[PDB]
Amino acid sequence: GLXRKXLCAXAKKKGKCKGAXKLXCKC
Numbered sequence: 001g002l003x004r005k006x007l008c009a010x011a012k013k014k015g016k017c018k019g020a021x022k023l024x025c026k027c
Contacts, residue, residue: 004025005025007025007026008024008025010025010027011024011025011026011027014027
């Protein structure tokens with residue numbers, strides 16, 4: 001595994017993380 005784009009792919013797949021994109025990967 002790996003990082004912030006790992007964290008963002010965490011945001012996409014816990015599902016319920018937030019609506020606003022390039023800023024969004026942070027939940």
